[PDB]
Amino acid sequence: MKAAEQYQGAASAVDPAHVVRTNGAPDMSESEFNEAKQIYFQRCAGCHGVLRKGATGKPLTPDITQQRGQQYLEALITYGTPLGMPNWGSSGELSKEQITLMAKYIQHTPPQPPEWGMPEMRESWKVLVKPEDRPKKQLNDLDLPNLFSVTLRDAGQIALVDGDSKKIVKVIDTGYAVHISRMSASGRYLLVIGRDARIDMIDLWAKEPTKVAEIKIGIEARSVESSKFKGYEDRYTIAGAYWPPQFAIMDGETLEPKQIVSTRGMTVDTQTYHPEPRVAAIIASHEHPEFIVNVKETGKVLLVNYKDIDNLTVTSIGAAPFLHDGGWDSSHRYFMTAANNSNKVAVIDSKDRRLSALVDVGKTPHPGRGANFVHPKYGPVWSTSHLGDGSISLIGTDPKNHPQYAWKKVAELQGQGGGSLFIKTHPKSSHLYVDTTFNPDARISQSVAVFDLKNLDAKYQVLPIAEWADLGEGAKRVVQPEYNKRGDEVWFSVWNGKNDSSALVVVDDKTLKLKAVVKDPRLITPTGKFNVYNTQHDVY
Amino acid sequence: MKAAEQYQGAASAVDPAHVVRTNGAPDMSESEFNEAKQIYFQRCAGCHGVLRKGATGKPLTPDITQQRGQQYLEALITYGTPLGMPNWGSSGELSKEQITLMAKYIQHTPPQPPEWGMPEMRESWKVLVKPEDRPKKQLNDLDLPNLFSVTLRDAGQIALVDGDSKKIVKVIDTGYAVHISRMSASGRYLLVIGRDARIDMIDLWAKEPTKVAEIKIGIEARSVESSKFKGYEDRYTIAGAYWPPQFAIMDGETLEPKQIVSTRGMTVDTQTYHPEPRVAAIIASHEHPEFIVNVKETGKVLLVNYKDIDNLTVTSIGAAPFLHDGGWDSSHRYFMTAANNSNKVAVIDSKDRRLSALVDVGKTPHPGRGANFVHPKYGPVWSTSHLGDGSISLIGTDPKNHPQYAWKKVAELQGQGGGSLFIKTHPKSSHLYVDTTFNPDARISQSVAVFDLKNLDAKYQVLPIAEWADLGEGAKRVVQPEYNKRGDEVWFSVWNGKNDSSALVVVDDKTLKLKAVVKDPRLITPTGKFNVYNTQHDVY
Ligand code: DHE
Ligand code: DHE
Ligand code: HEC
Ligand code: HEC
Ligand SMILES: [Cl-]
Ligand SMILES: [Cl-]
Ligand SMILES: [Cl-]
Ligand SMILES: [Cl-]
Ligand SMILES: [Cl-]
């Protein structure tokens, strides 16, 4: 009756005088609030995050913002900061009236976007073609290993480009602005994820590659990955979300949602609670049946063991805050990940399940998956490009046979300048390609630098990738070099405007000569290109 | 710098129109809000939680509460429901004007108490006596294994009573309303955790037992535990918190804070995010170097492996919502814990790291640690009483030599009625005791039922514990039977008010006749009683 009521009726130990109401912000209309909120996610949420704690420095919470004041915040938004906070008034990007509204907005409690659990996922889950009715053999005659999965960012779709043919073979509708493409261990299924957290599974064996499953694992995402460990091929596919701060494990044949795990938790450096730790790069392990999951704001690398997904076991490894992209080393044991805004590179030992070291590097490293090669003096190494730096950092990745040079910034190369984004090579190649996508100089932003590994002390050659495309108007930012299955050509993307004309430019790695140019009215804002074989077997 | 700012300056994939502002509640003054907020934690937070999502039914969040309306909520609060929601108007416990305020308060966004990270812990952390300054031998002449640690709830302290002398040997100030007492594997250090989350470690080898370390792991807590795996004795001490939803691991010798882990995460039944999953019972594994941690609202049981404390591995086991108290079986392998308000008992396999079964029992089981004995027909069993009915459930715990009765509610026993909290026995005892602390009948609450393991079909005997104390005015509620080391005597608390007289009653287990009554002006609101040896070695 009420005996259990009296049992739990005791007063909470929490002192009510220490629980506080959240107000004290300047009055804002409903129309005004929504206008600043539209600006925040259009211009600010990328760094500061949904809850405004995703960047360095003091956060944009009420207690902090109200302490500064209306005019401090207006002043700091108008003129920015030399530590990565741009200026929105001096640049003319925002208006005096708008900046005033932003200063008022961040003094209010940050509005919350909704959660996304199993009910939301299962409703988003669609098996368009059931595995029973899927082909048992490759129907088409495509040379799938040398297929490129090219992202048509603004078009909300992806294009399959036959490597040798240089022609588009199909265009598939996907989530908006796909970020990466990943292959299943079998090589039959192509996985793509949009920044809106929609995943699509493509069957490369159908008469024409078709989608077979679909699911939305959140509101904002970046990464997807498939199980690579011996015996667990196509068993499970993982995907991490920016919001909600979580990742999800799904069946690898149907994408059925199985498990959802929150990444909300304590940070490695300060060991305080963080309400929005965004999941970034995910990579499958060869040593154990685990997914190595990067968690950005908390600086944790998680080892998600799918041996038993009903009773999940996770090992949380401390590294450095702001974990971002990364990739394997030549051995496929040591996961080199870039804690970009910590200017460090963490080394995750997938075998011993620990952090091998933290390597100091240049200003904001950005390697993507990186580039591995054998240095004459320093043995095997792993290299990264940089955004705030024009440098290239080489890191020893050979502890067994090169303890002298291991997890050390053994040597630097210098590229065309800052704004670099991806560094690329190939085992069969003697060159090292470095793009300058976000360099503020036009010429540099549409060129790439090529180093000669045969003689590494020489200066690089500059290749005019955009010039070779002969597009015309547009910024024509070049981005992301990728090799073919055979390794003797290097594909480039000219990330021109949505309403301008773009292209993919293919270079002969043997001669460093223009080999071909890919143009098509369907190839809108081409960004990421992913060779099936090279991506599937971590060739980089 | 602009390079990195353009790279991370892309608009968020989050639609601002789907990120909504949280204020549509009826206006309240600051004086009125703080009065309703005070009643909430004084009367309601125990069940509904800090964020109003800890009870069954629909939560008291703005979206739901505003939908009902002011008149609906006033009525429901005024009258209640027959499903665990007490009456507050018919009761006459809250005035008509307070209920109106409470109805408005729960329509506002719930106020939030602060977090409690490593900085807050370290400043709260005190080492009163260094390990170097502690004795290498037991200075005092006390029979430590037979000492009782008695909680003096309202006095904010505990008393150490000598089992055979029946006298109080010292009184030690602690956190407010200590909840449990635990002993180190070495049996030298007594650990007590306050209702307010303050932990005190007591050295029983000093000339007089003195506090040697102190730490606050949160704002509200209930549970504390020590590592009991071979080779890891006294190496780590763990404690769980109600708020913030987290647990923490400290050094066993100094209580230095080492790690903090957030229990915020997804539930087991709906697989949705819960922002306040408060930690409940915690027990130390013998099969592996792990802590078994109960997480209430999410219904998860976490196996926290301390093999490597810097890289913490945690297996998450699903069970049923509202996990609470629990205990070992006779084997010390299967953790029998009760999801109270799910009316089930979960069996967690300490060895295989999985859920062996979910057993349906009575309304709101409350076992504490439980009571193990050998049923003449059904083999080794684990028993529990309930709050919602006078039932006593027996559950087989022998899968090796009694597989047909394993994890089955093999039989039921009837006590005096509902409102029971603790059932007890001893390996050297022929009797089985059940209390009725929260029974609404005065005499029932003052008595305890006693069963005969030699003849289970016989009706219980009733011993009037409070009557035997001869205390006078007061509710004189009796609670928590506890044996001594030799199992000769059974101790009971008479949990009277702080301005009334209380006592500890001791009964001769071999004869069931009163053996002693402990009265003392320092014995204020005695609740928990913890024999050092029986608590240390999990004898129940
Ligand atoms: C987590 C993450 C990965 C690795 C996932 C993995 O390995 O599993 C990744 C890699 C990538 C890769 C993989 C290339 C590779 O070599 O693997 C590409 C092409 C890429 C195109 C872009 N990224 Fe990416 N990217 C983010 C996050 C990520 N970028 C951002 O947070 C940021 C700064 C904001 C955003 O706009 O998403 C960001 C900006 C960009 C771009 O502006 C690019 C150039 C175009 C776009 O669509 O946004 N990111
Ligand atoms: C999590 C938890 C444990 C086990 C910890 C472990 O094993 O590591 C426990 C066990 C206990 C034990 C251990 C006895 C045993 O045999 O193990 C005792 C004496 C006890 C005295 C009370 N408990 Fe307890 N108790 C709660 C939580 C807990 N009770 C509540 O949430 C609730 C309902 C609210 C509250 O007031 O704290 C609650 C009410 C009570 C009481 O009213 C008692 C009788 C007096 C008091 O201090 O509030 N609880
Ligand atoms: C990165 C791509 C950013 C974008 C886009 C915006 N901000 Fe930012 N901000 C950023 C960093 C790395 C820092 C801290 C660096 C430092 O030491 O200054 C900041 C700082 C602010 C602050 C100051 C908070 C404080 O320290 O007291 C405010 C008030 C702020 N930022 C607001 C803001 C607004 C309104 C933006 C767009 C409308 C915005 N920022 C964009 C990184 C980035
Ligand atoms: C247990 C010890 C409780 C205490 C003390 C309080 N409440 Fe409660 N409440 C409880 C349960 C188990 C339920 C659900 C039962 C059901 O019939 O659904 C509730 C329900 C409410 C509701 C209704 C929510 C809804 O579905 O709309 C309200 C508005 C509510 N409770 C408020 C409330 C207040 C204001 C209290 C003290 C001041 C309070 N409750 C105490 C459990 C317990
Ligand atoms: Cl579609
Ligand atoms: Cl955590
Ligand atoms: Cl393993
Ligand atoms: Cl979780
Ligand atoms: Cl082990």
Residue numbers in the entry:
A (entry chain B), B (entry chain A): 4 to 543
Question: Which passages does the manuscript contain on this structure?
Answer:
Denitrification is the stepwise reduction of nitrogen oxides to dinitrogen and is utilized by many bacteria to replace the terminal oxygen-dependent steps of the respiratory chain under anaerobic conditions. The reduction of nitrite to nitric oxide is a highly regulated step, since both of these molecules are toxic to the cell. 1 nitrite reductase NirS adopts an open and a closed conformation, and it has been hypothesized that these states are linked to the catalytic cycle.
1 are likely to be caused by inherent properties of the cofactor.
